[PDB]
Design a protein around this nucleic acid. Structure first.
Ligand SMILES: [K+]
Ligand SMILES: [K+]
Ligand SMILES: [Mg+2]
Ligand SMILES: [Mg+2]
Ligand SMILES: [Mg+2]
Ligand SMILES: [Mg+2]
Ligand SMILES: [Mg+2]
Ligand SMILES: [Mg+2]
Ligand SMILES: [Mg+2]
Ligand SMILES: [Mg+2]
Ligand SMILES: [Mg+2]
Ligand SMILES: [Mg+2]
Ligand SMILES: [Mg+2]
Ligand SMILES: [Mg+2]
Ligand SMILES: [Mg+2]
Ligand SMILES: [Mg+2]
Ligand SMILES: [Mg+2]
Ligand SMILES: [Mg+2]
Ligand SMILES: [Mg+2]
Ligand SMILES: [Mg+2]
Ligand SMILES: [Mg+2]
Ligand SMILES: [Mg+2]
Ligand SMILES: [Mg+2]
Ligand SMILES: [Mg+2]
Ligand SMILES: [Mg+2]
Ligand SMILES: [Mg+2]
Ligand SMILES: [Mg+2]
Ligand SMILES: [Mg+2]
Ligand SMILES: [Mg+2]
Ligand SMILES: [Mg+2]
Ligand SMILES: [Mg+2]
Ligand SMILES: [Mg+2]
Ligand SMILES: [Mg+2]
Ligand SMILES: [Mg+2]
Lengths: 240, 46, 101, 124, 394, 336
RNA sequence: CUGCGUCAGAUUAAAACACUGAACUGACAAUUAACAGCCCAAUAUCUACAAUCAACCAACAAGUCAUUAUUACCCUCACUGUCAACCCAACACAGGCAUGCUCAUAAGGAAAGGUUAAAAAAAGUAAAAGGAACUCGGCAAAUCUUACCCCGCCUGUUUACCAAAAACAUCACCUCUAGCAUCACCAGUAUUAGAGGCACCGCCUGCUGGCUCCACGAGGGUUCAGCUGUCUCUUACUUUUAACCAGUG
RNA sequence: CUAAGAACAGCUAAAAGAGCACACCCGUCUAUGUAGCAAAAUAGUGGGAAGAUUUAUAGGUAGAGGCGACAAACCUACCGAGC
RNA sequence: GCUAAACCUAGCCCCAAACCCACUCCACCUUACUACCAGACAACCUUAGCCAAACCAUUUACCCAAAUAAAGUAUAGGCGAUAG
């Protein structure tokens, strides 16, 4: 199929970029993910998940002032428009973020810990143990990939020998370097999971199509059949 | 309901589906033209 | 001229000149009532109103003010004994208005 | 139900098809921004009409004429009629050299000519 | 970090060169002589090609650093499409001026007496508003790109009928499609303003000074407010290919050299395309400063000092329903430092000419609740518009 | 289906065709002055005329190069708008009517009227009587609308010994093309507007109909045709729409003449026209016994200036300038 | 794609007719651009703030409209579409057919070839007294009408051409899988995504199961009252059909 | 399914996968029709008709498959496997 | 006596022989039969199955370059059908 991905823009901008839906179709044109199609049109707002990105003419710690926290259709959480120096960019907003607040982005690791403020970006080697964190990265310069969803927050369990243990929202531990930059506090839209869809129509507004009507007897346990051993094959079923 | 009117004419669709350019796009469609040239068809495509 | 290759033109190139032209026009009587200054010609399909303007001024020394052309479709309804459609060739009709009244 | 054995012309198809197809007339300009057409004066073929005042020849030929045999013109014939007389005069005088063939009329290259022979850049 | 642009949408890598080219002393056999592609022959390496002549339709500009007007130092350009982030507060710092709420007493005192008011003034403004938004075109509800300019031209035309009372209004015209340029430094920052669009009211006589000498000298104690961490040059066109040049927009000899008032229109149908009230006033101040700065440089040379005769330039910015008034006075041309004499600017914000307009009657349960016409019309707003137009002629 | 009548038209002898469509007789010159019972500074008006003229050509600095095809829409158009805006302010002391007047910039003027009949040649409607409908969609560059109506140039019953031209073929041979869309009657504003009477129109010919191009097309005798063809169509559509706003139409024909003024220019040459709408009944039912006809006066095109060199205007004409002033100084007759 | 314009024709079957006969054959004629289509120098750089009379207010589903800097560039109106009683259904087919206006017309049309007034058949109208006694069933028709049970929460969806449902889907709930990026999922990150069950909610329960209940239904039954030719018991009239005459077949 | 468009009177109501009710979409019941006007229609009676709506245009998914609110539905008037 | 019925060529089949065609002008890979602008896309990969074996599952003949003969022989093969 003559499928060209809309993700062709190479320069970052805060302008909402028009994106075309896929409908669960891959580049070949066949369905690869079911239940995706239609819904209200959305414009993608590019998010800079690398919080510590100093300007071209600047370096080191810098500060940004929040301009507006608004709704993002693409993601569950809300986003905030911040301005640092002579540029503006989108970031993932925290639970407690307003228009006018000042956030700090630094890569400095001091001898002692520092007072962690919600929304600020500091390396994992300078954050107190136990503080809720979000938007963590595997290695420095990789960018935030984990704990992005609304209300999600990780736990800084321990820090040993330049590495830190991060408790993911799925209650799984992850080991990453202490130089990874993370955001203090939870993510916005804490009560996102408390929403009620209300009607089947609203699920079609989000681009989700109804499930297949086939009665699938197959499942995690029902579909998969344990093969009885020849000794146990005699006792599988007894008439009653 | 009532059938028989499955054909809804459209020149854009007709040229894009059975056109000369469409036929020569793939090696399989080239043989389609070659068979009609061998048979002597007055019109090789749309 | 028709059925000939026109030399390609680029910026600063020489003027395109034709010394022998194969365009042949025929004056015809309009089938409908026309203004007095209006003159009707049948011209080959390859001919433009700009060419016809220079064709009449250059050859017949006829001053022309406005030239309007249209393409006339030839009926393909006629069929011979083999039920094969017979095509009447399409021709272009040109309406020429005289210049000085 | 479409006729696939009829000539495809500009009168068939939707609006985009009809405006894009032509009738064979050569283009005499280009389209600029705003759908404005710019006509190039040099692209319009200018007719070189000679003066026919006092011209002896007429469209028909009188029947009281001899039936001369037809002799097609050849390159060998044209060379003998045009270039050969000049070479013979120079050959007898004794001033002949291949370097001066351009003086006899030979063109080593067609570049820089208003009417190139191959490939020709002029109309009929 | 996360790179933008998936590799599928980028240009694919060219196919690897045939191994015949890797053998020294071996001439590959390619299809360059056949003038078409074949799969069983090597791919020729074509040298770069040049057209050989200048073709405007297919011209390619030289690289940016090869442009003659290329400077390492960036110049930040403010134009009609620039939307300042901090609004007025950012505009005040670039122009080195002090904000004063309310129009000057002298300007407002012109229309204080009933003698300078227009006959049936309230009815005339209502008919101007009604014509602009209801009677202008065939369509029931005209778009904003249609009534925003018309509602302003009629008000100027309405104020231009007072030539009977004031013969001094015959020495002014309304220039359209006028531009100007102004270049200056603000703490080692080369800034340039290129105003365009709107109406430029020109006069044969300069506007008289508003603030007295003592009031101008009192600006030295005032200090410009800062907006850290946001930079003063944010939302500005940072261009490295520019030309420092001062331009009043007209050549020498123009009968109306002195600008009187700049009329700015946010004639955009879409709300996002329209400047915010805070941003619109920021555009007015920079354009008023840019127009006044060009006059100061043209008359007093290209030096930097405190002007002996400060230049006053007015400005009126409207969205078609909301009006902003500005009176800018240029007191100095030495803006590199943050100390010393600072300019003054009188600004009126959010002046409603009318609260709302109904192009159709509001019929609820077969009862006409709201008739056709403006709602919440404020005649006091037009008095300020008239006072600015009558400045310098009463 | 209705014929789209274009005022600024490239059709040859379009003035002769539009006279039959509007039932108008064209007269040379201007209407006779009414023999009926301050200081006008010509120097002040002359200076402003040159200042506005020199502003567009020389004084104003262009950010980008102005091309030949943009001269009408970047040089000629602003000059016409600015000249009228300044003149109405300089003539307000001499004419109080202009002060309480509505000035419009490029507003559309529409008028729909029915005149003539035809027998449909082909189709299922062949042999049936169908009326010939016409529509004028004109957008003058400037126009002045006033609350009161101007004085008539000639009486309503006045007649001239000149026959209105009659076309022997169908209107399609002008050429004129038929198209079906919304029928509008528009003076430049809706009916609710008190200023429903027209005073003066200002037109700028398109660069496609410029004088220089018509000379290349052997249309030297068609130069004057374009001026009076635009005036006949635009003023009839203006006066006709004003009559409709007053409740008059074909069956209820006008009881008083409707007059208007127009100034047609290409930027350099100026022409002046005056129109009077004596009759609005043009349908074959109503025009069968209608004796009266519409009257249009016209002047020859004259250049306002000869040549513009730098900041000096060569050969500036005050006769052309005064003719613009007289049109603007015209006012409705005052009551006792 | 010339397919009721003109003219002529040894013409002569369009489901009848036909001399001017003509929706046949041949020739001749025609639809004229302003509308519409056919657009744009390069390189960088810009574009947070819906729409809805956009002003109130109130939202979510988060939306349908913007440039500047420098360089290059000032030649001019070409080309094509334009007819009709028209298209897709083997047909001059009671079907299918997007949008703008007119919302009853200012436009477009003709249900009866002539006759007779048998049966049977179709549609419609009227009816004494009775009012479901008809019938698998108040189906049809008339009238403008109450109370429930069963099933399914509801709007919605399906066997195009015998099944519109109690079936499917559905919010809500529940299970299972996955710790991550440059083409689907996704330019996303466990408050997420996928694979499934069940069918809201509320109550009760295990450590998953059972009832209740709001509205809702061309679902399946039952019923008051009314209504009526459904019936006791049919009858009259009108129209189509019918039969006869003429044409086609 | 994708792209970019269009349509939804009036009334009761309220910021409703609300009610009545046109256009429009669908096809519940009955009758006509059964080589019919129609290889699924007609008349009346019905369900929906601001939404999970209807719809025009172009593009995509192709038979060891596609697609499917599973009817073994549909994929050019014989689909338990197209021609 | 109507409808009809009759007719002899057009051409074709199989061999031999010999190895065949494609630029008059114009248009023709874009929506073929369309005068006239930055591409970078590139070709190659066992046939299967019906059928026979009275099912079917291994298997089952398909010109490979000299007619004849060796010879349906040596061999192969659910040592079956058959292949050779
Ligand atoms: K139901
Ligand atoms: K078998
Ligand atoms: Mg589910
Ligand atoms: Mg299920
Ligand atoms: Mg078919
Ligand atoms: Mg369709
Ligand atoms: Mg044309
Ligand atoms: Mg066919
Ligand atoms: Mg056009
Ligand atoms: Mg009628
Ligand atoms: Mg009868
Ligand atoms: Mg009959
Ligand atoms: Mg009864
Ligand atoms: Mg019973
Ligand atoms: Mg019933
Ligand atoms: Mg249900
Ligand atoms: Mg409910
Ligand atoms: Mg339902
Ligand atoms: Mg069915
Ligand atoms: Mg269905
Ligand atoms: Mg059914
Ligand atoms: Mg269910
Ligand atoms: Mg019972
Ligand atoms: Mg009962
Ligand atoms: Mg009876
Ligand atoms: Mg009979
Ligand atoms: Mg509803
Ligand atoms: Mg409803
Ligand atoms: Mg479905
Ligand atoms: Mg099932
Ligand atoms: Mg089944
Ligand atoms: Mg099929
Ligand atoms: Mg077998
Ligand atoms: Mg078997």
């Amino acid at each position: 199929a003559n499928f060209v991905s809309w993700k062709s823009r190479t320069k970052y901008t805060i302008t909402p970029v028009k994106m075309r839906k896929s409908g669960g179709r891959d580049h070949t044109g066949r369905i690869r993910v079911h239940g995706i199609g239609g819904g209200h049109k959305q414009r993608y707002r590019m998010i800079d998940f690398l919080r510590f990105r100093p300007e071209e003419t600047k370096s080191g710690p810098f500060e940004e002032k929040v301009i507006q926290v608004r709704y993002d259709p693409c993601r569950s959480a809300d986003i905030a428009l911040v301005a640092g120096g002579s540029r503006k960019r989108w970031i993932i907003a925290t639970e407690n973020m307003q228009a006018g607040d000042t956030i700090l982005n630094s890569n400095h690791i001091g001898r002692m810990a520092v007072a962690a403020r919600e929304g600020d970006a500091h390396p994992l080697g300078a954050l107190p143990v136990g503080t809720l964190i979000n938007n963590v990265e595997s290695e420095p310069g990789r960018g935030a990939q984990y704990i992005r969803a609304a209300g999600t927050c990780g736990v800084l369990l321990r820090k040993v020998n330049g590495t830190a243990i991060i408790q993911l929202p799925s209650k799984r531990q992850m080991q990453v370097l202490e130089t990874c930059v993370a955001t203090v506090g939870r993510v916005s839209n804490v009560d996102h999971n408390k929403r009620v869809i209300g009607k089947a129509g609203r699920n079609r507004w989000l681009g989700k199509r109804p499930n297949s009507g086939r009665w699938h007897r197959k499942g995690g346990w029902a579909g998969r059949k344990i093969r009885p051993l020849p000794p146990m094959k005699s006792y599988v079923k007894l008439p009653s | 309901k009532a059938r028989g009117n499955e054909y809804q004419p459209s020149n854009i669709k007709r040229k894009n589906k059975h056109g000369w350019v469409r036929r020569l796009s793939t090696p399989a469609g080239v043989q389609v033209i070659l068979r009609r040239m061998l048979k002597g068809r007055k019109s090789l495509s749309h | 001229a028709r059925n000939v290759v026109y030399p390609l033109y680029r910026l600063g190139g020489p003027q395109l000149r034709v010394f022998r032209t194969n365009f042949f026009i025929q004056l015809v009587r309009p089938g409908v009532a026309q203004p007095e200054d209006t003159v009707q010609f049948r011209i080959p399909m390859e001919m433009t109103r700009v060419d016809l303007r220079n064709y009449l001024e250059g050859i017949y020394n006829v001053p022309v003010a406005a030239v309007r052309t249209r393409v006339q479709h030839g009926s393909n309804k006629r069929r011979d004994h083999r039920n094969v459609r017979i095509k009447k060739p399409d021709y272009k009709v040109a309406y020429v208005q005289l210049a000085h009244g | 139900g479409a006729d696939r054995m009829s000539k495809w012309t500009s009168k068939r198809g939707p609006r985009s098809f009809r405006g894009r197809k032509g009738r064979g007339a050569k283009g005499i300009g280009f389209l600029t921004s705003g759908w404005r057409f710019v006509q190039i004066k040099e692209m319009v073929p200018e007719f070189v009409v000679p003066d026919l005042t006092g011209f002896k020849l007429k469209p028909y030929v009188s029947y009281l004429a001899p039936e001369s045999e037809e002799t097609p013109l050849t390159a060998a014939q044209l060379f003998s009629e045009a270039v050969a007389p000049a070479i013979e005069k120079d050959f007898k005088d004794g001033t002949f050299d291949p370097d001066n063939l351009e003086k006899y009329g030979f063109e080593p290259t067609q570049e820089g000519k208003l009417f190139q022979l191959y490939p020709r850049n002029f109309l009929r | 970090a996360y790179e933008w642009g998936v590799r599928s949408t980028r240009k694919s890598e060219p196919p690897p060169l045939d191994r015949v080219y890797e053998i020294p002393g071996l001439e590959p056999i390619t299809f360059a002589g056949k003038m078409h592609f074949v799969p069983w022959l090597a791919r020729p390496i074509f040298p770069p090609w040049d057209r050989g002549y200048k073709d405007p339709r297919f011209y390619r500009s030289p690289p940016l650093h090869e442009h003659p007007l290329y400077k390492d130092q960036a110049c930040y350009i403010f134009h009609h499409r620039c939307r300042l982030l901090e609004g007025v507060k950012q505009a005040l710092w670039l122009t080195k001026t002090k904000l004063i709420e309310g129009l000057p007493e002298k300007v407002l005192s012109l229309v204080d007496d009933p003698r300078n008011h227009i006959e049936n003034q309230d009815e005339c403004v209502l008919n101007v508003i009604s014509h602009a938004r209801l009677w202008q075109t065939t369509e029931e509800i005209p778009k904003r790109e249609t009534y925003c300019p018309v509602i302003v031209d009629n008000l100027i035309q309405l104020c231009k009928s007072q030539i009977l009372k004031h013969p001094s209004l015959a020495r002014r015209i309304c220039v359209q499609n006028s531009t100007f340029s102004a270049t200056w430094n603000r703490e080692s920052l080369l800034l340039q303003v290129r105003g365009s669009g709107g109406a430029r009211l020109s006069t044969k006589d300069p506007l008289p000074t508003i603030a007295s000498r003592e009031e101008i000298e009192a600006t030295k104690n005032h200090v410009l407010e800062t907006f850290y961490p946001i930079s003063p040059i944010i939302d500005l066109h940072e261009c490295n290919i520019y030309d420092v040049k001062n331009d009043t927009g007209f050549q020498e000899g123009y009968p109306y050299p002195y600008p009187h008032t700049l009329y700015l229109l946010d004639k955009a149908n879409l709300r996002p395309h329209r400047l915010q009230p805070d941003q619109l006033r920021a555009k007015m101040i920079l354009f008023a400063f840019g127009s006044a700065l060009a006059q100061a440089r043209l008359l007093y040379g290209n030096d930097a000092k405190v002007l002996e005769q400060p230049v006053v330039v007015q400005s009126v910015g409207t969205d078609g329903r909301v009006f902003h008034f500005l009176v800018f006075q240029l007191n100095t041309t030495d803006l590199d430092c943050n100390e010393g004499v600072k300019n003054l600017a009188w600004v009126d914000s959010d002046q409603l000419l009318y609260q709302h307009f109904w192009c159709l009657p509001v019929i609820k349960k077969r009862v006409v609740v709201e008739p056709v016409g403006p709602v919440g019309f404020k005649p006091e707003t037009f008095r300020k518009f008239l006072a600015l137009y009558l400045h310098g002629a009463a | 289906m209705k014929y789209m009548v274009y005022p600024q038209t490239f059709a040859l002898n379009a003035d002769r065709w539009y006279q039959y469509f509007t039932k108008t007789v064209f007269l040379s010159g201007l209407p006779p002055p009414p023999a009926e019972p301050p200081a006008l500074d010509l120097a002040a008006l002359r200076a402003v005329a040159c200042d506005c003229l020199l502003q567009e050509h020389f004084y104003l600095r262009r950010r980008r190069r102005v091309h030949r095809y943009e001269e009408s829409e970047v040089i000629s158009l602003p000059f016409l708008d600015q000249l009228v805006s300044t003149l109405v302010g300089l003539l307000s002391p001499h004419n109080p009517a202009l002060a309480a007047a509505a000035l419009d910039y490029r507003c559309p003027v529409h008028f729909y009227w029915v005149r003539g009949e035809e027998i449909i040649p082909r189709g299922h409607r062949r042999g049936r009587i169908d009326d010939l409908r016409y529509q004028i969609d004109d957008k003058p560059n400037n126009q002045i609308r006033i609350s009161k109506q101007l004085a008539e140039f000639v009486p309503l019953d006045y007649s001239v010994p000149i026959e209105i031209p009659t076309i022997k073929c169908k209107p399609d041979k002008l050429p004129l093309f038929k198209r079906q869309y919304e029928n509008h009657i528009f003076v430049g504003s809706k009916t609710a507007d008190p200023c429903c009477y027209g005073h003066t129109q200002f037109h700028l010919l398109p660069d496609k109909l410029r004088r220089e191009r018509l000379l290349r097309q052997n249309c030297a005798d068609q130069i004057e045709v374009v001026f009076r063809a635009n005036a006949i169509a635009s003023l009839f559509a203006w006066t006709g729409a004003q009559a409709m706003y007053q409740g008059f139409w074909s069956e209820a024909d006008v009881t008083r003449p409707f007059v208007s003024q127009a100034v047609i220019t290409d930027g350099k040459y100026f022409s002046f026209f005056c129109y009077q709408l004596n009759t609005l009944a043009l349908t074959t039912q109503a025009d069968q016994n209608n004796p009266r006809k519409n009257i249009c006066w016209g002047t020859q095109s004259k250049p306002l200036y000869e040549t513009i060199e730098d900041n000096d205007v060569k050969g500036f004409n005050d006769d052309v300038l005064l003719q613009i002033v007289h049109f603007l100084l015209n006012r409705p007759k005052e009551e006792k």
